Amino acid sequence: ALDVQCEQALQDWNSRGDRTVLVIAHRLQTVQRAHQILVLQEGKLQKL
Amino acid sequence: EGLVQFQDVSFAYPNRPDVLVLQGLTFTLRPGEVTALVGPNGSGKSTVAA
Ligand SMILES: Nc1ncnc2c1ncn2[C@@H]1O[C@H](COP(=O)(O)OP(=O)(O)OP(=O)(O)O)[C@@H](O)[C@H]1O
Ligand SMILES: [Mg+2]
Structure with a gap:
């Protein structure tokens, strides 16, 4: 339930190399x- | 028939009437047609549905 702009903004910055x-x-x-x-x-x- | 008409509809929630969630909405839903309502969050779409 997030608009496209916020979906793109919260794409991959969650990780910080130690999370x-x-x-x-x-x-x-x-x-x-x-x-x-x-x-x-x-x-x-299912294996890739 | 099912013909809906919003004519300059404006709305502000009773708990916070000073803020207008909808301003001057004018459109029409006709049977046999689909009207998509798109926009960012907090725009007022669920308010239109309510
Ligand atoms: N019960 C309420 N009382 C006061 N303000 C409310 C209430 N419900 C929603 N709002 C506010 O009204 C505005 C529009 O909400 P609404 O749910 O209509 O938007 P929306 O565009 O459908 O949201 P979303 O895209 O996230 O589903 C928001 O600022 C929201 O915080
Ligand atoms: Mg909504």
């Missing part, structure tokens, strides 16, 4: 800039 971050997204939206991607379906993890 672990887990970004849960319904789709692959503004998450391709993440070091690791984990796809989950019906409670099972």
